[PDB]
Amino acid sequence: GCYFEEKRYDDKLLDFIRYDVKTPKKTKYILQRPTATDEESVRLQRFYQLGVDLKLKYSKRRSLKKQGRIKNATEELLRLANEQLKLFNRIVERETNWIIYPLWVMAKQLIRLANESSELNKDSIEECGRTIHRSFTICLNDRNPRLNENKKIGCYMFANLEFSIYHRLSNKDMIKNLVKVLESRVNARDIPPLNKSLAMEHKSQVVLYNYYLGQYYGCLENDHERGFFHLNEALLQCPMLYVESTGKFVLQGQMEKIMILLVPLALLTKRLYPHWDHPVIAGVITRSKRLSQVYPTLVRSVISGNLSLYEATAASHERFFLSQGLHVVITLLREVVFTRLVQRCWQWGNDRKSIMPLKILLATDEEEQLDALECRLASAIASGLLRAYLSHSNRCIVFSKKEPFPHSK
């Protein structure tokens, strides 16, 4: 109990804090200075008594035979974990920022505590969600401006715990709350940026926070430029390290489900596509059966103006794209494909002339095809994939002499 007296933390305390992993036969799990008359001291001495119990109830949890019902058993742990973290909240309200990562260790193993329960009809995540919410607010408003104790360094690590919760059962407003609350906070400088937060001491959460942010921005709010930015950064801070047993990326799993969103988001916003032989791209795309064929043909369809191959690629993996929150990205990326093909009848069919007949594009009822074509081009002009103007009279498009077919870069 010198951790709490002299405000430091070691593996053993986090190892003690880890109630799921059983400890060795030699046991050093105790609080010294037992006098607990002070009201705030038996908080530390029932924090103790709850910590001993939970680690005991985890050999208890699998030692059982087939009984059939462990509801009370899982409810004994959830309640113990709820009131223990609720009491770590009381202690960590009034101590330095030494104790935030031990508070976060406690919070993420309570998320796995409810995660193993498969049924969501119990809605027992509300307790921990509220628990984590106050746990996210303990650090969110540290009114000590000194950075020796300021808990706002751990702000962003605690945001990823709540993101995980607001995704369990799909809730896109709760995710929308926390992206926007946090945004103003370092715009107002009340918290330090993610690159100067406690996050860069445990960089799993650095990659994760840019995923949740980029994902929310790309799949839920439809801000593609910023959903790309954060997702791209989440991949750029993943380690260049590999498991030796298999030789594939440590973090291969995380790296690939970022790129499910990153590749199509990169092509819509910035017109960027991967170098396939590049170590990081190749290391992930080639070893992912899902991405090995769709995404390379997906890129080729767009670069080449191949609308059929894009539309077939998208029709054949519609369930995949819908499940990944990619439908607007795909539906909008299709109009990039259409404009590239428009660029291709300019380069190869009009000899780069600013005035182009619309009947060139029919070669790939006819009044109706041309009206529809005028309207699809008009929409692309209007959203900045073509800088041109239309003539219904001549049935032609008049590309700008300056910078037609623009794109962000």
Binding site: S204, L208, L236, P239, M240, L251, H275, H278, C345
Partner: protein
């Protein structure tokens, strides 16, 4: 169903990320959007039906 929240290792050094290695690594994003030409059955057959249009419409 499947959890990517459980990272296998919690932290690593900054020099081990891909952006700090991006001085020695090449850009992962090809930037030739404006000038990249691809050869496949489709591009070839598109040029075909297009040079046939400019012959029809000199």
């Amino acid at each position: 169903d499947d959890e990517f929240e459980d990272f296998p290792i919690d932290t690593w050094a900054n020099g081990e990320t891909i952006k700090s290695n991006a001085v020695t690594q090449t850009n992962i994003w090809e930037e030739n959007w404006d000038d990249v030409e691809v050869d496949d059955d489709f591009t070839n057959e598109l040029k075909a039906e297009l040079d046939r249009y400019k012959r029809e419409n000199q």
